[PDB]
Design a protein around this ligand. Sequence first.
Ligand SMILES: *[C@@H]1O[C@H](CO)[C@@H](O)[C@H](O)[C@H]1NC(C)=O
Ligand SMILES: *[C@@H]1O[C@H](CO)[C@@H](O)[C@H](O)[C@H]1NC(C)=O
Ligand SMILES: *[C@@H]1O[C@H](CO)[C@@H](O)[C@H](O)[C@H]1NC(C)=O
Lengths: 111, 115, 48, 146, 250
Amino acid sequence: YVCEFLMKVYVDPITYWKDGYNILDVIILIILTIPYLLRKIKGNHSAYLHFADGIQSLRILKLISYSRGIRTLIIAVGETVYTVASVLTLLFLLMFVFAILGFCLFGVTDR
Amino acid sequence: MRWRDRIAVLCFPPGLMLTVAALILFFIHMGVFASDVHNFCVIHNYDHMSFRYTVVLIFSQVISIGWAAMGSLYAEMTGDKFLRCFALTILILNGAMFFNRLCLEFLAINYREER
Amino acid sequence: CELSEEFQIYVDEVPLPFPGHALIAVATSVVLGVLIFIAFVFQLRNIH
Amino acid sequence: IPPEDWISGVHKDSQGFNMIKTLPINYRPPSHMGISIPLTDNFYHADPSKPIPRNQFHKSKETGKYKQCANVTSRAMCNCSEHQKFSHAVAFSDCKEKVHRFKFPVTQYPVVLEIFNERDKISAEPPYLVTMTEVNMRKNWQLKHN
Amino acid sequence: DVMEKKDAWDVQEFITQMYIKQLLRHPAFQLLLAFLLLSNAITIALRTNSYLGQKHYELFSTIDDIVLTILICEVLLGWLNGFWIFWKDGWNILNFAIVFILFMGFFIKQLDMVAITYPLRVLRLVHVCMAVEPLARIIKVILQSMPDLANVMALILFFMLVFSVFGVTLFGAFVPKHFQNMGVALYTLFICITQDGWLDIYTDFQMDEREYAMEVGGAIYFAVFITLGAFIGLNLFVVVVTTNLEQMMK
Ligand SMILES: *[C@@H]1O[C@H](CO)[C@@H](O)[C@H](O)[C@H]1NC(C)=O
Ligand SMILES: *[C@@H]1O[C@H](CO)[C@@H](O)[C@H](O)[C@H]1NC(C)=O
Ligand SMILES: *[C@@H]1O[C@H](CO)[C@@H](O)[C@H](O)[C@H]1NC(C)=O
């Protein structure tokens, strides 16, 4: 993985800084390298262990980053990100509305 | 044209309604402000303050500010510097007036009532 | 015999009465109004 | 409140709030038409040797009688005891200098009354009906009762 | 054409053009309004805790006054262009009702309290966030889908009633407290149609004779009715959704 970051630390970041899967994999590399750097040799004030299988699962995600067929599927489903974000924001707005409503209806009376 | 006939009947020249209304509002509001500072400074008869009418004259203050600004906007396009100076001066005195009376009211909190 | 008692209560830190809230509300409103109107006057005079 | 901290007047309820207030000298509670013009004719922390605070206006000039700390010279001269410093009663307020303290919204303050009857302590009974009054003519307090 | 000299109505039209160019086309004023609304929404989320409230209640009152006065100022600015156009609109009516209820509950004594002050604020938040583009298309077609959804609701409730006539025959005074009262029975059948965790009801009407009784008959009748109604309702919902969105991409 260090060799991977070494061959992605080239001038190709000029295209990795505007693309999809490329910025995704370099971000995965960064959030892989830093946590085990502060975990395997920690000597620090961390909380506890909860990001070992998560790190390994990010490595598995880097494995599945291959398979150009799945890449084409990701490209074909990648134009719905704004739509699902908008539906998620509408969902969150409805949760906030009924959150304040349920609080005002049942938690302020405190019975 | 015939400004005698313009001021006589059936209409007024465009603008110059809100400016005159702001002038008379300025007159009555100097009257009440002078009465307020007088009775707050010397004669001390707070039962006859303007402690009773407190929000309606604030509403009058802000609508007078709005009408002064609106008349200034409506009379700026006359191309004459005197009208623009007139409108800007009346707007400035009304605004500084408003800040002064707001400061006086905010100073006079402990004398009205308590909730 | 008369059964009576007396006590004292001190309260403080009243936020504000109605005129303070009214004054701050109208002050912010007219500050926004005069700022937007100064922008209006500046733009329309500089167009001329 | 412990008596040593009642003497000290520095109590904090682990929250940055003072539970004991030392009254201003010649203190008088406010009236209905204004909180800066007292019209109660009662003197708290009274001292004739000092200028009177917040006493403009003719009606407030015409009100306020010194009962215990009379023309007798000062606070150190007009004499009081521990029973007069811990008295919450009217006409013992001329040397009343430390009071309790609260926030602005006080809700559900428990008005509990116990009766002494020579062998134990009982609570107030529904046969013993109760009248509430304020000595300083205020109209900003309400009661909840069943 | 030439416009050698403008007239009074041209001056008025230019003034209205300036007034609609600002605060309606300028992104800066809308961004400032959205920033203020997001800040007071942060204060909304900071509520439900007196530990923050004990040093924030006066600031909460001040920001309430500020948002109320800027809302009524915006309403007055909209009114300036004309009362008829503002009254004949699809969403300005909602905004005017929101600010009217909020202002009446503020100035006049009302039992509206927190349950009206806060949801009205978040409704105004939703209305303002609709204005920015990448939620307006999605919002526009939710309201386009409700006329075609209303007929589905009507058919569902009519079938629900005409099968509850079958329901209320085996209901009432036996296996009670969810099958009686004729409104609790209807809403409990609605619960079972929404189809989650009805084995409490299954154990409720369980053990009639322990072998068959009506535990076979009524249970299979209501089970096939529940599954048919649930499938039909979900299908009709997604069908109305797909119809109206095919409308929005057409
Ligand atoms: C002094 O105080 C006493 C208190 O009993 C009172 O009777 C007397 O009138 C007072 N005299 C003056 C001059 O204030
Ligand atoms: C203390 O004051 C009282 C009146 O307040 C007076 O009668 C008494 O003589 C005083 N005693 C001394 C020792 O000053
Ligand atoms: C008074 O307060 C006490 C303390 O919480 C409570 O138990 C009681 O029900 C209250 N009574 C009324 C009438 O509010």
